[PDB]
Design a protein around this ligand. Structure first.
Ligand SMILES: c1ccc2[nH]ncc2c1
Length: 218
């Protein structure tokens, strides 16, 4: 199947990405606390629901939250300010809190059931968010011997996410608060800049955007 692209809300960031975030791929954003990773996730969860000529995929969303940072009212605000019904947009986000890394891994396997259910509806799942991908792994696997064990478990988790992305034509979007190896398709470094701006760079030009009542924008 042909790749789809989801606008981030920022023309600058969209250009950096080659046209938006891709289905059949895992895009990882990483950066320090406060760099805007979760705001970008909230914005994408709205943008994907737009029709294709407006930068979306007529898609639904699955969101796995490891830090209790999902904010339904932020979704509703972004949606309303972009002309979408806030309650319809929120209804199309399936939401789950992951309690630990083993639960997080099960939830990805569990997500396949809803993906299959919605696959031939008018709003199939097109975006799967894991925010944060790494927080539970970092807290649980620590000390001598943990590097190999943590990386091996993360590799399996990412393999599961790659399979869902590739098999069901979904964009997987993951966040990472930051010499270790990484298995995401594309890695985007986010940081704070001057004037409240955020700056994004591809890892392995730079886009600049603001966090606004519309989520993110130029
Ligand atoms: C991941 C994210 C959201 C979800 N809702 N139901 C199952 C599930 C898995």
């Amino acid at each position: 199947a042909t790749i789809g692209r989801i606008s981030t809300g920022s023309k600058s960031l969209d250009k950096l990405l080659g046209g938006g975030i891709e289905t059949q791929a895992i895009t990882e954003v990483f950066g320090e606390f406060g760099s805007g990773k979760t705001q970008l996730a909230h914005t994408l969860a709205v943008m994907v629901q737009l029709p294709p000529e407006e930068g979306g995929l007529n898609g639904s969303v699955m969101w796995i939250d490891t830090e209790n940072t999902f904010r339904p009212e932020r979704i509703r605000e972004i949606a309303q300010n972009r002309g979408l019904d806030p309650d319809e947009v929120l209804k199309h986000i399936a939401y789950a809190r992951a309690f630990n890394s083993n639960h997080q891994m099960l939830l990805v396997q569990q997500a396949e059931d809803m993906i299959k259910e919605l696959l031939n509806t008018d709003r199939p799942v097109k975006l799967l968010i894991v925010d944060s991908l790494t927080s539970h792994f970092r807290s649980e696997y620590i000390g001598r011997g943990a590097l190999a064990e943590r990386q091996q478990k993360l590799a399996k988790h990412l393999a599961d996410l790659h399979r869902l992305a590739n098999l069901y034509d979904i964009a997987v979007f993951v966040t990472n608060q930051v010499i270790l190896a990484h298995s995401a398709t594309l890695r985007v470094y986010l940081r704070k800049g001057k004037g409240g701006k955020r700056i994004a760079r591809l890892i392995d030009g730079e886009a600049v955007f603001s966090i606004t009542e519309k989520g993110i924008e130029d």
